[PDB]
Amino acid sequence: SFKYESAVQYRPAPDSYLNPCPQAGRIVKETYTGINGTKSLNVYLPYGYDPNKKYNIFYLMHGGGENENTIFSNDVKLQNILDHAIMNGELEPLIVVTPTFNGGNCTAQNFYQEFRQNVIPFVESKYSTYAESTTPQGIAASRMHRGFGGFAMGGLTTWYVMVNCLDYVAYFMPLSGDYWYGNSPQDKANSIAEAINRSGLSKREYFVFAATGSEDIAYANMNPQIEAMKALPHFDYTSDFSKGNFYFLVAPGATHWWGYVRHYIYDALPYFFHELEHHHHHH
């Protein structure tokens, strides 16, 4: 069903996608102990989840003042959108994980540390992703099937994950948050470029689909960063990820609110995980 567009436009999910779907994925509350102590997360498993199949995995971070339960709470209801999109064939089934940057020494900035050491091995040893094992080697070998995104301060988390975790993660969805490293947009872009240089990866091996609202305060700092990134050779600007690797979706009229941001995930998540995928698909 899915075909890449080169300049995909904002489109909310239908209102009916915000109500429960009969083909409901299971949401599992987990508790684990890592470098920031004992913490919890939620795991969304697609309807029909079969542990003898391999699933893409997308980790998705909340914003400031929120927690690991927010995204699947009544205030956001992202699972309804996921369920309906998967049932209708718009989105290939995947695992979605909602962790937290709260707890212990954890911050939105430093969460990537715990992500690498604790969250990936805990989740991906339990559930069936493309990681055949959860050693560093097994995680790195399955990076094309792993993504990270997040909203607001979780968008910041996403950028710090990118710069520090290119070895583990190929697809990035920063939502309404910019990267706070540097005193100018060029410093930010140059930091991302240096991370890419250090990783040794090609431009066909990492993908950034950023989004915000045209009335979302985060635009002010995102837009200059995006423009600086577009000028790098490291990024080829287009939503057609069969051709390039970088897009910035700006929703007209949308403000800094999960009510809109959930629709950015509806629009962007279907674009993830088809490059070097293991199924024979035409997009």
Ligand X SMILES: COC(=O)c1ccc(O)c(OC)c1
| Smallest distance, ligand X to C-beta of residue 64, A | 5
Q: How far apart are CA 35 and CA 176, in angstroms?
A: 28
The verdict on 51 binding ligand X (CB under 6 A) reads no
| Smallest distance, ligand X to C-beta of residue 21, A | 30
| Smallest distance, ligand X to C-beta of residue 148, A | 15
Q: What is the helix (H) or strand (E) element at residue 32, kind and residue range?
A: strand 26-34
Tracing tokens 């436009």 back to the chain, one arrives at 9
Candidates 14, 64, 104, 259: give the one binding ligand X (CB under 6 A).
Answer: 64
The verdict on 217 binding ligand X (CB under 6 A) reads yes
Residues facing 44 on adjacent strands: 27, 96
Candidates 123, 218, 251, 265: give the one binding ligand X (CB under 6 A).
Answer: 218
Long-range contacts made by residues 279-283, C-beta under 8 angstroms, separation at least 24? 283/2, 283/3, 283/4, 283/242
How many residues appear in the chain?
A: 283
| Smallest distance, ligand X to C-beta of residue 174, A | 9
Candidates 68, 83, 114, 178: give the one binding ligand X (CB under 6 A).
Answer: 178
Q: Which residues 6+ apart lie within 8 Å of 259 measured at CB?
A: none
The verdict on 185 binding ligand X (CB under 6 A) reads no
The verdict on 66 binding ligand X (CB under 6 A) reads no
Instruction: Compute CA distances 195 → 179, 181, 188, 243, whole Å.
Output: 13, 12, 11, 22
| Smallest distance, ligand X to C-beta of residue 205, A | 25
The verdict on 177 binding ligand X (CB under 6 A) reads yes
The verdict on 261 binding ligand X (CB under 6 A) reads no
Kindly determine how many residues on this chain lie close enough to bind ligand X according to the rule CB under 6 A: 11
Candidates 221, 223, 238, 255: give the one binding ligand X (CB under 6 A).
Answer: 221
What value, to the nearest 5°, has the Cα angle with vertex 156 and ends 150 and 160? 105
| Smallest distance, ligand X to C-beta of residue 182, A | 13
Tracing tokens 């990820």 back to the chain, one arrives at 241
Phi, psi (degrees; rounded to nearest 5) at 171: -120, 130
Site for ligand X in 125-164 (CB under 6 A): 152-153, 155-156
Phi, psi (degrees; rounded to nearest 5) at 212: -160, 180
| Smallest distance, ligand X to C-beta of residue 58, A | 19
Q: How far apart are CA 41 and CA 36, in angstroms?
A: 13
Binding site for ligand X (CB under 6 A): 63-64, 152-153, 155-156, 177-178, 217-218, 221
